[PDB]
């Protein structure tokens, strides 16, 4: 497994009852293949917390995952070429932090048993989701 | 009841084992107040077909469903500005047709007992999802 990316991303964490607050949160995005099962290629990505080691939420998606992911989502690159797209997000966001108003914004809202994250650029209406993807708590 | 658009629009229609194939639907955007019930404001999106009196799709939304709706989706204006960014959306999907790759692009996508309904707009990776609405199936 090889490690595309390692380190602190802004991020607006939304919990129900609580105001939006603004987090730094350790993203760990592996790719690796299972041989033993054919090949299968894999995606995961890892939420956590340097200053709190119990804070965890982790996504697999295999490559069998990205052929309905890519038709439902309407994604024009391969599952090669989908971790790069998430981290050039992410890299937006990032650069966007230190001025007033970020245009890219990473955002994860958790709930129970699941938490969405997502990043976004704000254009003259709303929030607009560039990519949108479901962590399970914990592992 | 106020008619805020009702005209065609060239639509992406998505079935399971289907190729997408364009087709003019027809959309009515209607936008009124239920009094008797404190004044409640809805919204109404009907997707028709002029050449099929029996194909309907249905969307209903209240100012207290938008309230919930604002903030999964980030949107950033108010219910009575709601319906005139669908609006501007649809008009940037008729506009764009004529083009050889259209920039802004509806798409439906059709299942058992519930439809999708997108505004994508093609950028260097993927469909970006200005717009992700649920219709039911006829009324």
Do not use: Y
């Not at 602190?8 to 592996?30: G, M, N, S």
């Not at 050039?88 to 007033?100: F, H, M, N, T, W």
């Amino acid at each position: 497994a090889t490690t595309l990316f390692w380190r602190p991303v802004p991020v607006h964490v939304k919990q129900q009852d609580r105001e939006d607050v603004l987090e730094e949160l350790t993203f760990r995005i592996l790719t690796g293949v299972a041989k033993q099962n054919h090949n299968l290629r894999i995606l995961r990505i890892h939420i956590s917390s340097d200053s709190d080691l119990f804070f965890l939420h982790t996504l697999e998606v295999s490559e069998e995952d990205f052929q309905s992911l890519k038709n439902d989502e309407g994604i024009l690159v391969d599952f090669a070429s989908f971790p790069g797209k998430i981290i050039s997000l992410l890299e937006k966001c990032i650069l966007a932090q230190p001025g007033d108003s970020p245009r890219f914004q990473a955002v994860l809202t958790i709930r129970g048993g699941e938490s969405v994250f997502k990043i976004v650029e704000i254009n003259d209406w709303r929030q607009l989701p560039h990519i949108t993807l479901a962590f399970r708590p914990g592992n």
